[PDB]
Design an enzyme around this catalytic site. Structure first.
Site, short mmCIF file in Angstrom:
data_model
loop_
_atom_site.label_atom_id
_atom_site.label_comp_id
_atom_site.label_asym_id
_atom_site.label_seq_id
_atom_site.Cartn_x
_atom_site.Cartn_y
_atom_site.Cartn_z
N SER B 47 -64.54 53.74 116.28
CA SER B 47 -64.45 55.04 115.62
C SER B 47 -64.06 56.18 116.55
O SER B 47 -63.72 57.27 116.09
CB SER B 47 -65.75 55.37 114.88
OG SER B 47 -66.87 55.39 115.76
N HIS B 48 -64.10 55.95 117.86
CA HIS B 48 -63.73 56.99 118.80
C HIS B 48 -62.74 56.54 119.85
O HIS B 48 -62.64 57.12 120.94
CB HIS B 48 -64.98 57.62 119.42
CG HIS B 48 -65.77 58.40 118.42
ND1 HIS B 48 -66.67 57.80 117.56
CD2 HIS B 48 -65.68 59.69 118.03
CE1 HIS B 48 -67.09 58.70 116.68
NE2 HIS B 48 -66.51 59.85 116.94
N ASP B 188 -66.82 56.27 111.29
CA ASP B 188 -66.95 54.94 110.72
C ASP B 188 -66.88 54.99 109.19
O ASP B 188 -66.52 53.99 108.55
CB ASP B 188 -68.24 54.30 111.23
CG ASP B 188 -68.16 53.97 112.71
OD1 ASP B 188 -67.42 53.03 113.05
OD2 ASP B 188 -68.81 54.65 113.52
N1 LIG Z 1 -69.76 65.13 117.83
C1 LIG Z 1 -69.31 63.94 118.24
O1 LIG Z 1 -68.45 63.82 119.14
C2 LIG Z 1 -69.90 62.73 117.57
C3 LIG Z 1 -69.74 61.47 118.13
N2 LIG Z 1 -70.29 60.35 117.52
C4 LIG Z 1 -70.05 59.13 118.27
O2 LIG Z 1 -69.85 57.99 117.46
C5 LIG Z 1 -70.76 56.97 117.89
C6 LIG Z 1 -71.16 55.69 117.46
O3 LIG Z 1 -72.51 56.15 117.07
P1 LIG Z 1 -73.69 55.55 115.92
O4 LIG Z 1 -73.02 55.06 114.87
O5 LIG Z 1 -74.83 56.30 115.88
O6 LIG Z 1 -73.88 54.23 116.86
P2 LIG Z 1 -74.86 52.99 116.59
O7 LIG Z 1 -75.64 53.20 115.35
O8 LIG Z 1 -73.98 51.80 116.76
O9 LIG Z 1 -75.46 52.76 118.23
C7 LIG Z 1 -76.39 53.67 118.59
C8 LIG Z 1 -76.48 53.09 119.84
O10 LIG Z 1 -77.48 52.09 119.41
C9 LIG Z 1 -77.50 51.01 120.36
N3 LIG Z 1 -77.70 49.83 119.48
C10 LIG Z 1 -76.96 49.55 118.32
N4 LIG Z 1 -77.33 48.45 117.70
C11 LIG Z 1 -78.34 47.98 118.47
C12 LIG Z 1 -79.18 46.82 118.35
N5 LIG Z 1 -79.04 45.96 117.33
N6 LIG Z 1 -80.15 46.61 119.33
C13 LIG Z 1 -80.30 47.50 120.38
N7 LIG Z 1 -79.56 48.64 120.58
C14 LIG Z 1 -78.60 48.82 119.59
C15 LIG Z 1 -76.04 51.17 120.91
O11 LIG Z 1 -75.65 50.31 121.91
P3 LIG Z 1 -74.30 50.16 122.15
O12 LIG Z 1 -73.47 51.41 122.66
O13 LIG Z 1 -74.12 48.97 123.24
O14 LIG Z 1 -73.46 49.61 120.92
C16 LIG Z 1 -75.92 52.66 121.14
O15 LIG Z 1 -76.59 53.24 122.22
C17 LIG Z 1 -71.24 57.42 119.31
O16 LIG Z 1 -70.46 56.95 120.40
C18 LIG Z 1 -71.26 58.89 119.16
O17 LIG Z 1 -71.30 59.61 120.35
C19 LIG Z 1 -71.03 60.42 116.31
C20 LIG Z 1 -71.21 61.68 115.71
C21 LIG Z 1 -70.65 62.85 116.34
O1 LIG Z 2 -67.88 60.42 113.84
C1 LIG Z 2 -68.38 61.54 113.71
O2 LIG Z 2 -69.38 61.76 112.98
C2 LIG Z 2 -67.78 62.63 114.43
C3 LIG Z 2 -67.81 64.00 114.29
C4 LIG Z 2 -67.05 64.55 115.29
C5 LIG Z 2 -66.54 63.51 116.06
N1 LIG Z 2 -67.00 62.38 115.52
#
Ligand SMILES: NC(=O)C1=CN([C@@H]2O[C@@H](COP(=O)(O)OP(=O)(O)OC[C@H]3O[C@@H](n4cnc5c(N)ncnc54)[C@H](OP(=O)(O)O)[C@@H]3O)[C@@H](O)[C@H]2O)C=CC1
Ligand SMILES: O=C([O-])c1ccc[nH]1
Ligand SMILES: NC(=O)C1=CN([C@@H]2O[C@@H](COP(=O)(O)OP(=O)(O)OC[C@H]3O[C@@H](n4cnc5c(N)ncnc54)[C@H](OP(=O)(O)O)[C@@H]3O)[C@@H](O)[C@H]2O)C=CC1
Ligand SMILES: O=C([O-])c1ccc[nH]1
Lengths: 332, 337
Positions: B47-48, B188
């Site tokens: 997703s990024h 996502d």
């Molecule tokens: N403003 C912005 O720029 C934003 C950016 N995002 C980005 O998008 C993202 C993906 O985020 P989100 O969907 O919350 O990610 P997840 O729900 O996949 O992962 C959260 C994290 O959980 C850990 N994790 C996931 N599954 C497991 C498991 N089964 N057991 C143990 N640890 C686990 C991950 O490890 P691991 O990394 O190895 O997969 C990671 O640290 C991030 O990279 C985030 O920074 C989201 C919103 C806003």
């Molecule tokens: O995936 C998101 O939620 C997000 C917001 C800004 C960048 N990524």
């Protein structure tokens, strides 16, 4: 039931601690803390905890006369050896230095090690916000939470607390355990004969259960929000223990101390001057966020519940079962 | 099905760098974003990764974000640094202040970096990982765009607001977590809509506030829920306050791109706290963290935060980065090839 004023409750609890071996200084700190929780309606961490405080002190498990040792180790870093005493007295001992550093450098850390924390965390962060500073704190407790995807407990209930000032009201504060439910509330649920909703814990065989007794009798708790809460709990172990020098939640046990209930770990506090070199006022920004939250329908913000109960307690006194009041008086 | 192809990590970086330069970013910005985006693809952070290139370009073309902005680094305290991103991306602003921040963190024990007026369109682990590789602990928060309903509210207000954390360990790669405080990342949700599939239930609601699994329903007037109920909501509120309230940047609801067709990047801010875990200590943090990892494996946690990415990273460096033939061609075209 009965009614006791906030100041009377503090005096009552202070006497109890002194009677049971704490120094006068420690008694002052714990009495105010415990009474404050009751005042705010924080049931699992108010007078409910007195028996545990006392049983823990009786064995020497926690030193009620410990003298915190403050270590000025950096322009923005303070460490304090709680010397097997409670965390609150240690925080109190280094608070002035911490605030001086935070205001001067812009941010400062207080790393408490060898401390016992048996209370809510909002009392630790709220005072900083009342003074216009932002505070974040983490404390690791006792092993009982199963890391996401694991088979046995390892992490403690590990709470995280946050306090921030707002121009038009009391500090914005949240204080949450990273476990799905606080252990103290599992104990209360067992006492009241209530079942818990799904996802709070498992039994001694690792199977999901809604019976608080099953959780307490060899069972364990689960992290809130699955893998995300689990990651945050891991962070608490690393910050409140790994960084401070205190024990991880699994690096101590009560086997040799009958009645011991307090975790012997550590605590981390990060204090920030939100306006350091700022061309704005943080308190005005936070006030706007509150206005917007009300605007979208959030009637209850973190802390509101306690502030409402607090106002009630100050105006009508703290409601307490007559039986509990008598027990406290006898202990005093 | 879509035939696939592999591209090396360095080749992907060069391709993305050319794309950014051709589309109006300064060379410093192109270098930073190219490495960041390619790194995400390398680690399997779909997703990024390259999925964001179109959004980056449409945001730049609309004039919404300044690809040639020069960050203004403000040394405001012994342990405090602010950076005016000047309507540019967050990563270049962080890069501009990185050395000063580390110097302060090591000298004072801890230091804060408050970035305001920045656009962050990526994962947060790339921001904290480097500090951990250098033996420092880093915690960061970024607020995004309004789409998350605060606990108990009726309308969205908070952004997906992620929190990232990185810490060193004696026997391996940095321990790192990076999570959105929303139940799912907006990116996502977009991918699901693109691939025409549904999302797990309990993560979002439609325009009527009713539960839905249709990504299109969430994207078209709907909203997302905070993870872990009231606790996740409290953490999201904290992110608004720290990444925007404290930095000076816009809250997730305080910017409007209605006058910039194609704009997709939030114009907010970012907070980073960097700590020397051993400042004045009588022990070694890296040793303590390694012990925690050992204990985690001991109780049965095979997957620790970061492990999945480190595995994909290894696969990418050994076999190359897998990319759909169509996507590679599009990237090559954007680069001018
Ligand atoms: N403003 C912005 O720029 C934003 C950016 N995002 C980005 O998008 C993202 C993906 O985020 P989100 O969907 O919350 O990610 P997840 O729900 O996949 O992962 C959260 C994290 O959980 C850990 N994790 C996931 N599954 C497991 C498991 N089964 N057991 C143990 N640890 C686990 C991950 O490890 P691991 O990394 O190895 O997969 C990671 O640290 C991030 O990279 C985030 O920074 C989201 C919103 C806003
Ligand atoms: O995936 C998101 O939620 C997000 C917001 C800004 C960048 N990524
Ligand atoms: N090591 C230790 O000393 C430990 C201490 N604890 C303590 O026990 C505690 C109780 O914690 P936990 O069970 O997690 O608490 P909850 O699950 O009740 O509350 C978490 C918090 O959520 C906010 N909140 C709750 N419900 C809502 C809602 N409906 N809408 C908006 N905000 C809401 C609270 O506000 P509000 O306060 O106003 O109700 C508070 O900040 C804490 O005080 C904690 O510090 C727990 C584990 C370990
Ligand atoms: O209720 C709890 O989980 C707890 C642990 C230590 C103090 N309270």
């Amino acid at each position: 039931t009965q009614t006791v004023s906030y100041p009377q409750l503090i005096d009552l609890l202070r006497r109890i601690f002194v009677v049971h071996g704490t120094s006068p200084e420690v008694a002052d700190v714990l009495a105010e803390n415990c009474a404050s929780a009751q005042r705010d309606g924080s049931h699992s961490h108010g007078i409910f905890r007195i028996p545990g405080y006392l049983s823990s002190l009786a064995s020497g498990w926690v030193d009620g006369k410990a003298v915190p040792v403050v270590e000025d180790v950096g322009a923005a870093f303070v460490r304090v050896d709680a010397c097997n005493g409670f965390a609150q007295p240690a925080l109190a001992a280094a608070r002035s230095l911490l605030i001086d550093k935070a205001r001067s450098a812009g941010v400062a850390i207080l790393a408490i090690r060898g401390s016992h924390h048996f209370a809510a965390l909002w009392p630790d962060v709220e005072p900083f916000a009342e003074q216009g500073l932002v505070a974040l704190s983490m404390v690791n407790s006792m092993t009982c939470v199963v890391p996401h995807g694991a088979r046995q407990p390892l992490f403690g209930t590990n709470p995280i607390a946050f306090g921030a000032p707002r121009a038009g009201g009391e500090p914005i504060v949240f204080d949450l355990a990273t476990s799905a439910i606080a252990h103290g509330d599992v104990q209360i649920a067992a006492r009241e004969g209530r079942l818990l909703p799904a996802g709070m814990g498992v039994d001694r065989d690792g199977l999901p259960t809604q019976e608080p007794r099953a959780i307490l009798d060899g069972g364990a708790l689960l992290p809130f929000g699955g893998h995300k809460g689990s990651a945050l709990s891991m962070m608490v172990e690393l910050l409140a223990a790994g960084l401070t020098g205190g024990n991880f939640s699994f690096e101590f046990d009560w086997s040799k101390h009958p009645g011991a209930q307090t975790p012997w770990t550590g605590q981390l506090l990060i204090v920030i001057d939100p306006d350091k070199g700022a061309g704005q006022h943080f308190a005005q920004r936070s006030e706007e966020l509150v206005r917007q939250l009300h605007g979208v329908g959030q009637e209850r913000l973190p802390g509101d519940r306690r502030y409402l109960e607090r106002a009630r307690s100050m105006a009508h006194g703290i409601v307490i079962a007559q039986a509990d009041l008598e027990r406290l008086q006898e202990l005093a």
